[PDB]
Amino acid sequence: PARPITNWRSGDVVWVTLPSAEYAQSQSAMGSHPAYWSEEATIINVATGQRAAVSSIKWDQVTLNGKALHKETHSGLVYYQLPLMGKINFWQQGTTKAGYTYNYNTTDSDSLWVWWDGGSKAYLYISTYTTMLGAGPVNITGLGAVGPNPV
Amino acid sequence: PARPITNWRSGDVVWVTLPSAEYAQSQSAMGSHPAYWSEEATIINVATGQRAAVSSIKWDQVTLNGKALHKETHSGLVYYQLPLMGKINFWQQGTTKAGYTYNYNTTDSDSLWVWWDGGSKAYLYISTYTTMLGAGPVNITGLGAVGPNPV
Amino acid sequence: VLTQPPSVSAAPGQRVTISCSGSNSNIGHNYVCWYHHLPGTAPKLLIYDNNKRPSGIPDRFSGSKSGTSATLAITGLQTGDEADYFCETWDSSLSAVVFGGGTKVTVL
Amino acid sequence: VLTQPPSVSAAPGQRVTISCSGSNSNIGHNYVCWYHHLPGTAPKLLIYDNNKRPSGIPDRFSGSKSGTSATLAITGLQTGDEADYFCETWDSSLSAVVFGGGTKVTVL
Amino acid sequence: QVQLVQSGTELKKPGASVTVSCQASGYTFTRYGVSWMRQAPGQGLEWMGWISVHNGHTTYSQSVQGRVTVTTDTSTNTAYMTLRGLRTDDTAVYYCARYRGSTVVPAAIVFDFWGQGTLVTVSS
Amino acid sequence: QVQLVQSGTELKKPGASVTVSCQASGYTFTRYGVSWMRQAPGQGLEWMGWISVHNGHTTYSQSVQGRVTVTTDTSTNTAYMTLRGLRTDDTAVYYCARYRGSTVVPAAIVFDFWGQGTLVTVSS
């Protein structure tokens, strides 16, 4: 009697934490733009209270408003898009010091890109601008509002 | 058997919506910096599910981690601070077009400033940079993570 | 500098499209506004933020913006809509408020 | 250009403070790193992001940053810590990676 | 209701100074700004300059050669506009509006709630 | 474990060209970058330049007068460094590191997991 973690409505609140996360420079799912990424991240639905590790989720079974998430392959590796609605907010975990995204002065929404190997291995990406929180590894906690289906 | 809306922990998720909201230019609670503000806003706790109108809350009885919210008087009007932790995220309601804050490229957290008259009248302020969403009136939905007590 | 047609005309019941044409510093990065002005009266706001009506403005009036152009649509033209219609936006190059030229609407 | 003391010294069991001094384009807007280097060996990372240890670095080593200065603290100095210690940051003025000068640590 | 009532029509000489008032009501006068536009006979509107009543901060156009000056009375809720050095082509209907918005790079000014206009004739 | 193993010591003449290798192991070589630093006898380290193995993008210092050139072999996971026009004061221990971070205005480069160094002597 609970909505599982592999079920997202447009309007849910996602609470991702990133145990110690490294900076990427040229991430291809988000164009050619930088990112912080973690190996052992944890995705949380706030309104339902359902918590799950990112690497323990079959990401082909996750649906947004019933329909399946958008997938892209870049250099032979498959990335999954959970589109947000608004900019993704993130900050160093436990510290009030915050970070800001790549399109930090642009009226665009962000997404939440997930690499998935096929087994028990998955990465989680947050679109960033630079190393405003460090070059990594650094604990990051994110916050986003779940968005519409990509047309 | 429910936490009231006038009770905030450092780590809650706030979901403010702003029915049609006007642009301010020189808001004094947030320095001298711009803002969108609404008269009939609604504050929502996402993890508990408690919804309440902003104008129907006695804001002197709202507590953060038990302790009372920080208050400032500017030009003889009292403003209450619900400090966030990370930047505040906001967007045009129903639209994926987003907005961005004043310190949009600065590693700072935001707050969530509430003017309160003393009776049934209260305003809600979101720190912005310019009219990236319009000169007002415009429907805005916000999103923030509730932060530590201001030292 | 915002350029408009000097006159647009339609039968009673049809629609008109009143269009400005600025540049990348006039309209492409800013929000345009549309005003209604009888001669010898005060101007009246119709469209703000390129597509939004105030209270007390009918659904007949609708606006849009596409790049450096912006078009006021008056769908279902009737009598009483015989005045000037003109733009307003901010020019970041000149650091000034620039207006259109006004558009006569003649009911056939 | 990052400037360091050429030599810092303490008794076994005390603490040392090895400090760089850059400018507003070296350290005031960037994150500094501290390295450990015996002569004739490879350098080894100690502090990154001004205050953070990698795995396998003891709690004895701690760093900080205050404005355009940055200080490596080695609390509880023992034998085996006799090498050079030097900074690294990005200079946005020169568009280059700038290093310190190395600091000798002599155990008394 | 929000209303702006201006002063009556005036007739000046070439070289005089014309002062046009704009009474305000129905809103907090220190919350918003007040602009000033003109309309030559046969042309569209031309912006001249505004003021912000929060602190006092005027921003005029370039086509007027520093001849305009906009001040406000906070007590009577009335904003003024003094144009000196009246050339013959300054005959216009001078309008008063309620300035509201921003001028940073995504910009939006609305000029809602105008005033009725004031004809100033510069002749002999 | 992540290791960088360089080439052996070399002895050149004034005016020759020295090529220093840097074998990599223990990590995905196309994920990170490889820098090159030197150490004159009696001084601290001096940065010379890097490469990014994602696409190939070199960024050298100014104190070397366009004499360095850094290339990579993707198949053998090995990065190179060719220094031409050897002056007498180019005698140094040339180090290899794993570049990681950003150079935009909040910047942080780490240079973790260095290599053991290679002495190059330019003499007769």
Tab-separated table of C-alpha atoms in Angstrom, chain C residues 27 64-71:
chain	number	residue	atom	x	y	z
C	27	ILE	CA	12.264	42.532	-28.188
C	64	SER	CA	2.527	36.762	-28.598
C	65	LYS	CA	6.242	37.069	-29.278
C	66	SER	CA	8.481	35.182	-31.713
C	67	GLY	CA	12.116	36.246	-31.741
C	68	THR	CA	12.437	39.975	-32.419
C	69	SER	CA	8.784	40.282	-33.480
C	70	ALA	CA	5.612	40.583	-31.429
C	71	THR	CA	2.030	40.435	-32.638
